[PDB]
Amino acid sequence: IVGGYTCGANTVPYQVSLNSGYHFCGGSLINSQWVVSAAHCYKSGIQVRLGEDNINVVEGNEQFISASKSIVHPSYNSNTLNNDIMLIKLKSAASLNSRVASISLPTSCASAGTQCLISGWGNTKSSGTSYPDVLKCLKAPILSDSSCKSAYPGQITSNMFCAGYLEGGKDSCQGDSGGPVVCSGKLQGIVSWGSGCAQKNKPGVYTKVCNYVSWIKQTIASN
Ligand SMILES: NCc1ccc(C(=O)N2C[C@@H](n3cc(C4CC4)nn3)C[C@H]2C(=O)NCC(c2ccccc2)c2ccccc2)cc1
Ligand SMILES: [Ca+2]
Numbered sequence: 001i002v003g004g005y006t007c008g009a010n011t012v013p014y015q016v017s018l019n020s021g022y023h024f025c026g027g028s029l030i031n032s033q034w035v036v037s038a039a040h041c042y043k044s045g046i047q048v049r050l051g052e053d054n055i056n057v058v059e060g061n062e063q064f065i066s067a068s069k070s071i072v073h074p075s076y077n078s079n080t081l082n083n084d085i086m087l088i089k090l091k092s093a094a095s096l097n098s099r100v101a102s103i104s105l106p107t108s109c110a111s112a113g114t115q116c117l118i119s120g121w122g123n124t125k126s127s128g129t130s131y132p133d134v135l136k137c138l139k140a141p142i143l144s145d146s147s148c149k150s151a152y153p154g155q156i157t158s159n160m161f162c163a164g165y166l167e168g169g170k171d172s173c174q175g176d177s178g179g180p181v182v183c184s185g186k187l188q189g190i191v192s193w194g195s196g197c198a199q200k201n202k203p204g205v206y207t208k209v210c211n212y213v214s215w216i217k218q219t220i221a222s223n
Contacts, residue, residue, distance in 0.1 A: 001118065001136035002126050002198040003170035009053035010061055012119045012135060014103035014187075015180060017049040018088075019064075026120045026179025028187050029102045032093040034220050035067075037178035038190050038207065039076035039086040046070065048090055051100045054133045055121055061099045065090045071219055073212070082157045084192045084207045087219055105217070106186040109210035112144040116163060116183040118204075120191065122175030126168075126198040131175060138172070140164045142183070143203055151201050159211050161189060164203035172204045173197035181206050 016035055018025040025041035027048065035048055051061040068091040075083040094100055110116070118138045124130045140163045143151075148162035156162070163181060164171050172179070172191045181189030189206030196202060 001120055001122055001138050001176055002124055002173050004136040004138035007119060007135045007137040010051060010099035012137065013099050013101035015119050015135060017052050017055050017121060018178060019047045019049050020045050023055050023121055025177055026191065027088065028180040029094065030105060031102050032096055033090045035088040036187065036190065037086055037088060038192055039072045039084045040078065041178040042070055042072050042086055046088065048088060050094050053135055056133045063094050063100055065092055065094060069223065081193050082159055085190060085212050087216065089223060103180060103182060103187045104185060105213050106188055106210040110142055110183045110188045112142055114142045114183045116140055116142060116181050116188060118172050118181050118191065120172060120176030120179040123173040123197065138170055140170065151203060152205065159208050160205050161208050162203040162205055163189065166201055166203060168198050168200040171198040
């Protein structure tokens with residue numbers, strides 16, 4: 001997250017860290033046994049880390065649970081990033097409490113202008129590289145589909161939305177992908193892609209979660 005703020009320990013209780021020996025992606029806990037992340041975060045040997053603040057220090061509220069199964073969306077296209085969503089089933093149910101909690105799925109899609117919270121452990125610089133140890137947060141509005149398409153001609157599908165600031169300076173960045181975009185207590189987006197970070201006219205692009213609620217619910221109900 002570039003131009004954000006320190007969230008505060010365990011204030012984003014649905015945020016998880018995907019670890020394969022090191023943090024590589026965010027995710028969102030949607031029930032005691034399932035996490036939503038980006039399909040581009042797929043890899044073997046994922047350990048889901050819940051209740052994290054400083055990802056380099058064991059602080060006392062963590063739960064580390066291996067993934068038993070990963071399900072990438074059947075229509076994910078890694079060249080276009082269309083349908084950039086995946087489900088991860090935990091080997092065991094997380095113990096839910098105030099600091100490790102699920103996030104509700106949207107019923108309804110969120111409009112341009114809706115304010116959201118984006119969080120992650122990604123790079124905090126737009127030029128240069130600095131990876132924080134603690135969770136960073138950014139409040140950002142959903143942008144109109146027309147401004148999103150004008151920023152990225154020929155690349156925004158009906159399964160994507162932009163959020164952020166066209167003036168730049170505040171955005172998600174490398175290491176934040178797979179993480180949550182929450183609006184009014186609902187998971188509306190997944191950090192997906194963008195052209196660099198925090199650059200003018202290049203806002204972040206997010207997977208539109210509301211389009212996947214039927215697939216998420218059916219997949220969990222069966223797996
Ligand atoms: N400003 C918007 C914006 C927001 C988020 C991103 C972003 O995070 N992004 C952009 C993401 N992404 C993936 C792709 C297509 C190839 C499929 N295009 N864009 C990838 C992630 C990143 O770079 N994360 C660093 C992370 C990694 C995880 C999965 C795949 C690739 C890289 C990594 C790798 C190795 C070690 C540690 C971490 C990029 C831009
Ligand atoms: Ca920790």
